[PDB]
Structures are given as structure tokens and as C-alpha cells.
Design a protein around this ligand. Structure first.
Ligand SMILES: [Zn+2]
Ligand SMILES: [Zn+2]
Length: 65
DNA sequence: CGTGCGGATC
DNA sequence: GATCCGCACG
């Protein structure tokens, strides 16, 4: 496309991952993960951060554009 | 067992 | 703003 052949868009990372600059497991089903019992991707893990895709599911979902 | 950082390209 | 990616140390 344009920037899809270099990186990004593989599984969208956590809040702390975007700010820590790190890819991870917590995918588009991180929620369904908690459902099947998730915990914390490799990031939130090493830094006991906050594996979150919630504020996210409501952060990017809100507002227009 | 945590710790952070430069970049693709819009 | 977003996601991807590794790595070298104690
Ligand atoms: Zn993550
Ligand atoms: Zn996480």
C-alpha cells in the first residue's frame, strides 16, 4: 500500500506499548483474551504496565476524526 | 526480570 | 497515533 510493507498494523499494541515503542501479543482480541484469561503482553509484562485495549476501545472509537 | 529507543508512512 | 522490532546488561 504505502507504509504497510515496512511495519505497523500486525496486531495493534497496548497503550504502554505505543508509548514504550514495542510490539506485542495483546491483539484485537486482548479483550476476548481476558475472557479466555489474558494478563499482560511481553511489554506490560516486563514493565508490569497496564495491558489495556479499553480506554483504547473508547479512545480511538470516540470523537469524529 | 525489567529498561528504553529510531524509524515507515500516512 | 498507530504498530513492529530487536537487543545486551546486571
Ligand atoms: Zn503490549
Ligand atoms: Zn500489554
Amino acid at each position: 500500500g504505502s507504509m504497510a510493507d515496512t511495519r505497523r498494523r500486525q496486531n495493534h499494541s497496548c497503550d504502554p506499548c505505543r508509548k514504550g515503542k514495542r510490539r506485542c501479543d495483546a491483539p484485537e482480541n486482548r479483550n476476548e483474551a481476558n475472557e479466555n484469561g489474558w494478563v499482560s503482553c511481553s511489554n506490560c509484562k516486563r514493565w508490569n504496565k497496564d495491558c489495556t485495549f479499553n480506554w483504547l476501545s473508547s479512545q480511538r472509537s470516540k470523537n469524529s476524526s
